[PDB]
Design a protein around this ligand. Sequence first.
Ligand SMILES: OC[C@H]1O[C@@H](O[C@@H]2[C@@H](O)[C@H](O[C@@H]3[C@@H](O)[C@H](O)O[C@H](CO)[C@H]3O)O[C@H](CO)[C@H]2O)[C@H](O)[C@@H](O)[C@@H]1O
Ligand SMILES: OC[C@H]1O[C@@H](O[C@@H]2[C@@H](O)[C@H](O)O[C@H](CO)[C@H]2O)[C@H](O)[C@@H](O)[C@@H]1O
Ligand SMILES: [Cl-]
Length: 247
Amino acid sequence: GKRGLAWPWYNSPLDPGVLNNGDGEVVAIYDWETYAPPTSTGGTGGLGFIGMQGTMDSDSSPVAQLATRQAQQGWATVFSLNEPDINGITPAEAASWYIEWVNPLAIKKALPAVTSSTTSGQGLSWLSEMISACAGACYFDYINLHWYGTSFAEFQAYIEQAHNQFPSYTIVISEFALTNGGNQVAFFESAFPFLDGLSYVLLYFPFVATSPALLQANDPGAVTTVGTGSCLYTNAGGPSSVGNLMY
Ligand SMILES: OC[C@H]1O[C@@H](O[C@@H]2[C@@H](O)[C@H](O[C@@H]3[C@@H](O)[C@H](O)O[C@H](CO)[C@H]3O)O[C@H](CO)[C@H]2O)[C@H](O)[C@@H](O)[C@@H]1O
Ligand SMILES: OC[C@H]1O[C@@H](O[C@@H]2[C@@H](O)[C@H](O)O[C@H](CO)[C@H]2O)[C@H](O)[C@@H](O)[C@@H]1O
Ligand SMILES: [Cl-]
């Protein structure tokens, strides 16, 4: 029971309960925000919502309301900043903000989702720098990885590399897929049993729990970089070839 729906803001036309068949492989949903998932039903299809303060403060996710939203919605887990390593946030800045605003939530917490960049001061390098800046004063349960690349072998080596750099830590993968042009179905088919087998991986969320039509209209940048082959829904709102693996 490690799988989750990476559920975008534009997903009002779709029903998260489509990818929940009661077998209990799919357990979680997050929407990059602290507001409840926008859905066709207005519910989360029996999945546990994970609030996310994905920027330091926004109109959609006001950090002044993070603690009140958490208490009001009953989250068991919270995610923090989305890809600060490429969004202009220094490790020291992230550590200070995380201690002020995320530390106080007395639930399960993940450090910010970092990219798979190999550039010094991005990706896992940035993450190490933030753990240094934290100076033992950050409270967290999880490190949170994104990965986009061209093969299962590369993905497997990256997760192994993160584990070798952070051997004590538990990992959440809040976004992952191949870049455009690969065989997304074969990748996820290999990745799900690999991740299900790792004791130090708690949750994974394929990019992305939407349809090709919604991804094209609302996130043309993701279509450029990933394509529409990892969408868990068809335009008809049913499970795609990738969605079918989630069950
Ligand atoms: O109508 C659905 C929902 O819309 C919310 O406002 C949204 C923002 O949440 C959205 O924010 C995007 C992030 O979720 C994503 O990670 O990054 C992108 C790109 O930077 C953001 O745009 O932006 C849209 C587009 O303007 C807004 O309409 C409301 O806050 C919410 O109450 C409402 O249910
Ligand atoms: O994220 C690690 C653990 O955080 C816990 O809450 C912390 C409190 O126990 C501690 O006393 O204070 C800090 C600062 O507010 C809290 O973050 C959670 O209760 C645990 O579930 C979590 O594993
Ligand atoms: Cl990563």
